[PDB]
């Protein structure tokens, strides 16, 4: 709960002043209805035209004053929101350069676009719109209620008769189906999933059909049956709950309660006039408080998400390409091991390979060496230095990596190859590109090496992968962490990517996330993992002679 209020800590003073101005503006907006009551009292008293003129000028000036304040609040509140949002975007920018690099491959969490674009926009609506709208929605009924009680406390109480009947019928309607209100969000979530499945499995339903076609239809009918059975019995409650709050019902209660008072001399007829003006729509004002407070809740959830991102842990710094893993264990979630008691020594110049079934934790152990996450227990050392003690400039100058889903920065090809070292000349870049088997397609482009790249490009998966392999080659990292899935990501470009990786892997320590065991026969050290635990370690022929789990995997190939 405190996460939302902690983000908006510096906006305590602007938001308080904004709420005070909106309270002031709403009262100024209700002032004309007070002046009409004074106008009627002037007319009944036979006041001279001079007093009628001053009252008319007072009303016109308040309308002008309210318009000016609402315009002045909007401009000032926009400037406050524009300065805070710029501060926040600067903070999000600095946090994205300090979060652990595995945070961008999360599971079961909001995307970066939602946290940066949508949530920052929800905060802007919160500061500029939802809070002033909520303050007006709460102050208008309270100001009206106090004025109508000052005018007369007897006809003010009978305004609550329709209100109590609404709350009583709302309470009866709520307890009577309290289970179903809790089920209804889960029915919506289920149907969102089933609608996605129906849209996803469309081709099967076209050519095969059968049980698949009627599965979604029958479950759709169940949902519609749930809605109809849930809401149909509450027609009587909901209709009667709506007529009591209508202005026509309030007008009758006001007049049937005021006319007996006025006719019998128990009321001054000008004291009924405030109720006729403002008190008729009093029921619809109380129902607007809920929508006013809904805006605060929606914005505060967004403030909840943004502060949660800003509260994440970061990469702390402590204190021939050899790599030492020593008693390493790792938890993605607390108390859920994924790596347990793994020990390895990637000797300099040797190609070490990780092998195992899906979910064995092989991919995580490569992510740990590049420091996508910090090991919860144990240590990983590179050239005798624990990777925790290394800065990002020091670590990634020693431990490069080419993992799956490679990325291209906005810029020309020359920068993309020379991203690691922009000072490299075009001769050095060209040799690196030819080393990665991409120089052919680069010349095939119309602009040559000046071809622009970015979030969207015509290059296929294999082509941009070889561009990234060209970047890694020119990075010159003695240690390398490689994912074998980069090879068969583009089967039609498989051989070219293999040649690039073959050129990349030479006189460099290598870690391989192996998926096809036939590509592994000449690796210097095989590692077999299942459920996060190293099972066997040794060369290809030696482990086959042992005949352990590795030979079972090979027979399973």
């Amino acid at each position: 709960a405190e996460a939302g209020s902690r983000l908006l800590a510096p906006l305590k003073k602007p938001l308080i002043v904004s709420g005070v101005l909106q309270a002031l503006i709403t009262l100024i907006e209700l002032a004309p209805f007070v002046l009409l009551v004074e106008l009627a009292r002037l007319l009944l008293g036979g006041a001279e035209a001079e007093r009628l003129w001053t009252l008319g000028l007072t009303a016109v000036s308040l309308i002008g004053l309210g318009a000016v304040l609402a315009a002045a609040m909007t401009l000032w509140l926009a400037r406050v929101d524009a300065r805070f949002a710029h501060e926040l975007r600067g903070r999000l920018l600095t946090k994205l350069s300090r979060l652990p690099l595995g945070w961008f491959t999360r599971r079961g969490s909001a995307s970066t676009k939602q946290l940066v674009q949508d949530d920052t926009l929800a905060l802007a609506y919160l500061i500029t719109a939802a809070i002033p709208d909520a303050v007006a929605a709460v102050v208008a009924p309270v100001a009206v209620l106090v004025y109508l009680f000052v005018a007369d406390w007897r006809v003010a109480l009978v305004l609550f008769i329709p209100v109590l009947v609404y709350l009583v019928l709302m309470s009866v309607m709520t307890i009577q189906s309290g289970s179903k209100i809790a089920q209804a969000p889960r029915w919506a979530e289920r149907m969102g999933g089933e609608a996605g499945a129906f849209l996803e499995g469309q081709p099967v339903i076209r050519i095969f059909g059968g049980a698949a076609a009627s599965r979604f239809r029958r479950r759709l009918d169940d949902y519609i049956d749930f809605l109809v059975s849930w809401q149909r019995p509450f027609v009587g409650k909901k209709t009667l709950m709506d007529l009591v709050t209508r202005p026509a019902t309030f007008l009758w209660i006001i007049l049937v309660a005021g006319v007996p008072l006025v006719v019998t001399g128990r009321m001054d007829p000008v004291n009924l006039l405030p109720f006729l003006l403002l008190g008729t729509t009093f029921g619809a004002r109380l129902l607007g408080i809920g929508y006013g407070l809904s805006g605060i809740q929606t914005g505060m959830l967004a403030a909840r998400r943004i502060q949660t991102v800003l509260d994440e842990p970061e990469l702390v710094v402590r204190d021939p390409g050899t790599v030492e893993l020593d008693r390493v264990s790792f938890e993605y979630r607390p108390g859920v091991p994924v790596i347990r008691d793994v020990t390895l020594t990637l000797r300099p110049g040797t190609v070490t390979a990780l092998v195992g079934p899906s979910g064995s934790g092989k991919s995580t152990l490569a992510a740990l060496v590049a420091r996508f996450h910090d090991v919860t227990q144990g240590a990983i050392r590179v050239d005798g230095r624990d990777i925790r003690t290394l800065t990002a400039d020091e670590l990634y100058r020693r431990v490069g990596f080419v993992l799956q889903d490679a990325q291209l920065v906005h810029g020309s090809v020359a920068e993309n190859i020379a991203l690691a070292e922009p000072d490299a000349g075009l001769e050095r870049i060209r040799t690196a590109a030819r080393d990665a088997q991409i120089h052919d397609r680069i010349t095939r482009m119309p602009d040559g090496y000046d071809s622009v790249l970015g979030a969207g490009s015509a290059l296929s998966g294999g082509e941009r992968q070889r561009v990234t392999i060209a970047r890694a080659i020119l990075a010159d990292t003695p240690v390398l962490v490689l994912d074998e899935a980069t090879a068969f990501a583009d089967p039609e470009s498989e051989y070219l990517v293999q040649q690039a990786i073959n050129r990349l892997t030479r006189d460099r320590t290598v870690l391989v996330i192996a998926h096809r065991l036939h590509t592994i026969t000449h690796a210097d050290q095989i590692v077999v993992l299942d459920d996060g635990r190293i099972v066997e370690v040794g060369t290809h022929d030696e482990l086959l002679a042992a005949g352990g789990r590795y030979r079972g995997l090979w027979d399973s190939g």
Binding site: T74, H86, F104, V116, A188, I207, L220, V235, L517
Partner: protein, 569 residues
């Protein structure tokens, strides 16, 4: 509005008439109730308040008639809401299976998912929550304006002409308010797009030791843009302030007009006060509509989604191994052409491989043959019969496909396989399971083929899912089988299952396979090499390799690609 009328079923076209006439009756009763304040209040403020009893008697009689018509319109509102819910959802669920597969783009799929899932509780309460308040508030200022004509013609003209001005203010306020939201959303999206790029390329930047220069560059760009954009602010009145100002000015204008008449002697003081109250009853509905601006905006959006789905284009419509003929076939996903004059004839009873570089148009051919899509130009024929002219049942039974994605659904593994032909006997399932090499998977599962393979069931690997999908296609008795290869990298048994499906099936039918590796096309009778949406090379395996063409080079690359080892050649 035309889309909402289209949702009405033929059953409730009568009840909508009852709803409409009772809504007008409700608006007339409220207008008569508001104008009855003219004599009621004019007598209440007079020398003798006791003359107010008669007009309170008429007011309460109008009020009770108001409640009777209001509950009837609410009852018809709930009935129409449920009927509209069942009608639209069922008509929307029946529409989509007939929709051409080109329509299901990611954005179009998003609207279709929204229209199906998120419109449940909304459509049930559309007419009661939105239309009844909206119509009552819209017609009541004009109803009061017309009714005041019978009290005073210039008065009714002035109050009726003020309806046009005040609705004009609502329209202008809506335009300014929505334009402001458009600008607020777009400027924020302009600020933050650089941050999304910074977060996207973080692995590239961090690994390349350029994260801090890139962070400073983005920080400088944000600072300059905000410094330029902050000074452009100017003191603008928002949309809501414009309308509320228009309401107050109308209030003071009418009150000033009433007082001016009183000073001129054209009205009495009690009647002037009564007109002040009635001309607050007249302004009040305009504020009621302004509260429905958010609800009306969302409802307009969802009705646009439902209109989009219900307006989706539908495919037209009318056991030996058929021949598949392509004649001048051109097909495009909008403007993106994928096939350019492709033409070939698959010999009946033979297996034809389809191969080519990544991209190309390989998968589009099988989707055209199976009837998932219809060609933009040219024709696809089965034994000289156009696929589009086939009857729906004939087209369903014509073709069997193994898709790139298995598309397994929630259910038992045997149920996942029985959808090919539920009339098949258990031995047919066993044979199709054997050829698909799923019997090896049944040895792993606890309950065998009865095991659930859904999202909440069992987590099958990629190869196992494909072998279930191959079991679907082999079980079906369709005279055509299509294959679109996709396997897990390790599962060689999946390739063995595909080989058995091509070869070990005794059923006589034409076979087509889009292939990626040599293990399957080696058994094929002929190959079509497709590049850039055209068949750049065509021939048999022996014919193509003897020619030493593009397919031979592809054959050499893949054979080499099946033999490498890291740390060696």
């Amino acid at each position: 509005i035309r889309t909402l009328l289209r949702l009405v079923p033929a059953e409730k076209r009568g009840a909508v008439a009852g709803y409409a006439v009772l809504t007008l009756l409700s608006v007339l009763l409220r207008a008569v109730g508001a104008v009855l304040l003219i004599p009621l209040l004019a007598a209440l403020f007079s020398d003798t308040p006791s003359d107010a009893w008669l007009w309170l008697g008429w007011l309460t009689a109008v009020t009770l008639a108001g409640w009777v018509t209001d509950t009837n319109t609410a009852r018809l509102g709930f009935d129409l809401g449920f009927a509209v819910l069942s009608r639209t959802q069922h008509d929307m669920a029946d529409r989509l299976p007939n929709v051409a597969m080109s329509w299901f783009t990611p954005d179009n799929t998003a609207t279709a998912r929204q229209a199906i899932a998120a419109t449940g509780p909304e459509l049930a309460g559309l007419v009661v929550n939105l239309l009844t308040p909206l119509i009552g508030a819209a017609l009541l200022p004009a109803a009061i304006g017309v009714a005041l004509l019978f009290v005073s013609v210039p008065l009714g003209l002035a109050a009726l002409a003020g309806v046009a001005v005040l609705f004009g203010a609502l329209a202008l306020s809506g335009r300014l308010s929505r334009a402001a939201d458009k600008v607020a959303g777009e400027t924020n999206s302009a600020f933050t797009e650089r941050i999304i790029e910074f977060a996207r390329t973080q692995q590239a930047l961090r690994a390349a030791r350029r994260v801090e220069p890139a962070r400073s560059q983005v920080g400088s760009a944000l600072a300059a843009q905000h410094g330029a954009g902050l000074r452009l602010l100017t003191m603008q009145i928002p949309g809501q302030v414009l309308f509320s100002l228009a309401g107050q000015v109308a209030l003071i204008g009418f009150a000033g007009m009433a007082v001016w008449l009183t000073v001129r002697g054209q009205l009495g003081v009690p009647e002037a006060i009564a007109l002040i109250v009635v001309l607050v009853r007249y302004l009040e509905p305009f504020a009621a509509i302004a509260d429905l601006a958010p609800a009306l905006e969302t409802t307009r959006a969802t009705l646009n989604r439902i209109q989009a789905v219900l307006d989706a284009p539908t495919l037209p419509a009318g056991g030996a191994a058929p021949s598949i003929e392509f004649d001048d076939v051109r097909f495009s996903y909008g403007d993106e052409v994928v096939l350019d004059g492709v033409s070939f004839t698959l010999r009946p009873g033979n297996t034809t491989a389809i191969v080519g570089p990544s991209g190309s148009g390989k998968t589009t051919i099988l989707s055209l043959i199976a009837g998932l899509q219809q060609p933009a130009s040219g024709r696809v024929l089965l034994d000289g019969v156009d696929v589009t002219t086939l009857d729906p049942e004939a087209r369903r039974a014509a073709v069997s496909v193994v898709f790139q994605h298995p598309y397994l659904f929630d259910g038992t593994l045997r149920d996942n396989v029985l959808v090919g032909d539920p009339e098949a006997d258990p031995d047919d399932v066993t044979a199709a399971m054997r050829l698909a090499r799923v019997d090896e998977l049944l040895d792993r599962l606890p309950d065998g083929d009865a095991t659930v393979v859904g999202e909440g069931g069992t987590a099958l690997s990629g190869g196992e899912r494909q072998r279930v999908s191959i079991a679907r296609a082999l079980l079906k008795p369709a005279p055509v089988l299509l294959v679109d290869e996709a396997t897990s990298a390790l599962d060689n048994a999946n390739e063995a299952a595909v080989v058995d499906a091509l070869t070990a099936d005794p059923r006589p039918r034409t076979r087509v396979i889009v292939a990626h590796r040599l293990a399957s096309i080696r058994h094929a009778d002929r190959v079509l090499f497709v590049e850039a949406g055209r068949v750049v090379e065509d021939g048999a395996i022996d014919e193509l390799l003897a020619a030493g063409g593009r397919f031979a080079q592809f054959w050499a690359q893949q054979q080499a690609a099946s033999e490498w080892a890291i740390g060696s050649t």
